[PDB]
Symmetry: C3
Subunit: 222 residues, 3 copies
């Protein structure tokens, strides 16, 4: 060709169709949304793999069943209702599958009370009562800072030493770095589970069970 040649009749027919069947635009918008979601999924799993050393293998982290082969990281806040309602199931899942390694990240999204519960937990970490304290703190309906201390006291934790480690600048740096890790993983809130490349946003227990099964099978393929 050597000439741009307009075709008004073709355009009129295009407009007529679109106006008479505008649902085509909804369908195309849905295609684009599925495209955008797949892009986000790829970015999330690439980030999970980039920071896996920090997500799954941080010495400062509280780890339930450190023998586990499959590492499930949980970002949580001790006063988030979704975290509290998912906690019993998470602990039952570690209870029934010993090959699970549960990394507990303290992702404080609320105020001083939640920060206080996290610091107590991290201070008592090395006294070997993390499973019980985690379950008990999550069990209190309206967990205060005073309540958190009373719960940790009622479990025989060395309170003087747990409080000393909790407020230390090391625990402060630990929590700050965890907040940074959540930001790098583009997390939106709590709970947020990370198993394999998968990210489970929220208290979606069934999805987390499925992801653990997938990772067990995939890692078993060797």
């Amino acid at each position: 060709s050597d000439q741009s040649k307009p075709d008004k009749a073709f355009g009129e027919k295009v407009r007529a169709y679109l106006l008479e069947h505008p649902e085509v635009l909804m369908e195309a918008s849905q295609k684009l949304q599925e495209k955008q979601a797949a892009q986000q999924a790829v970015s999330s799993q690439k980030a999970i793999g980039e920071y896996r050393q920090a997500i799954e293998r941080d010495p400062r982290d509280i780890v339930i069943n450190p023998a586990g082969t499959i590492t499930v990281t949980e970002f949580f806040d001790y006063r988030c209702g979704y975290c509290r309602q998912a906690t019993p199931a998470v602990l039952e899942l570690v209870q029934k599958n010993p090959d699970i390694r549960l990394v507990l990240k303290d992702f404080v999204i609320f105020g001083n009370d939640s920060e206080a519960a996290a610091r107590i937990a991290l201070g008592a970490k090395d006294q070997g009562k993390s499973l019980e304290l985690h379950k008990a703190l999550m069990a209190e309906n309206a967990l205060d800072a005073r309540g958190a201390l009373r719960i940790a006291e009622r479990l025989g934790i060395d309170m003087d030493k747990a409080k000393a480690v909790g407020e230390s600048q090391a625990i402060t740096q630990h929590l700050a770095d965890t907040d940074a890790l959540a930001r790098a993983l583009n997390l939106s809130g709590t709970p947020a589970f990370i198993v394999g490349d998968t990210l489970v946003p929220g208290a979606d227990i069934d999805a987390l069970k499925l992801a653990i099964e997938q990772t067990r099978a995939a890692r078993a393929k060797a």
Copy 2:
């Protein structure tokens, strides 16, 4: 046919038109919005008909001119400015058209003050001073709970008995069930008028007048 045959030239012409006349997408989006609005209108009128027994014929409700053939239900809050500015016109409309039956639903959307005005009105319901108390409460600019009591006192209402009925668990259940009815009718706020199948959202006096005329004519067709 036996073969899917691509046509890149047709698609290029489609893209060219859309990019050169993207207003077609606005026009199609407008068509879809009109479709969605008509769907919502149908759902609203079907719901109004489903719960008509509760909307128009609840013995606990305050009813102005119970003789009326045409039932106009109003969901209102005594401290909503739109309700207060529409009230004089609503009462003039019942004043000039005796065949109107005005059901007064107390749809408390604000705090304790509004709840207090509603309870006083429902407590004094059976003392035969509802029109006057409704108009006077709506007339006070900054209606407090103290103010509402002073208004009801200045109208000769038996205050000891009106206060006794107001706080009763019956009035509490009445208000709770009304809040539920508004939720089932997908109401967004106050005022909200319901005449025939029509729902008038807000202080749209002209639309309400028109809807009463339509229902009078339709019910007169027998």
Copy 3:
């Protein structure tokens, strides 16, 4: 023609293309956004020209280097961080280009503290210390009403007379009319610069420098 003749095959091909290349809709949406932005730009510059007498030539306004040919109007709030960070550069720009006439509009968007700083500045206007007071008020990190008075006192301003003029009903009308002018210019916040027909929304120093150059060149074309 004498007949509307449907063409289902043409419409199916349109739908197929759109679903297989829905990015065409994003591209068309971008075209429409560029169209809407150009419309807004035209409306803004037409409004700037309509109210130029008020923007650039209001006797009550504080004006730095009133000799300047090029009038740059700034809407600002003494406690807006963007205004405080842009202020040093604005003053350096007047410092290096004498032909600039800087009109200072007090666009109070915050509470009493900002209103107090503006009233002090407008009260001291006629004592010939506006450049210094403007720079000093903008220099205080957490400017209070008490702080603003201490800054104006530390600059030798006649405090009794500056305070008398500040609270006067004239200064109140001045600020109210400025708030009205910003509303007529559809301003969204502070800072907001106006030079020639151009409106620079925010602390976009480079754009403001460019706009001053353009206006200098255009007005020099005679």
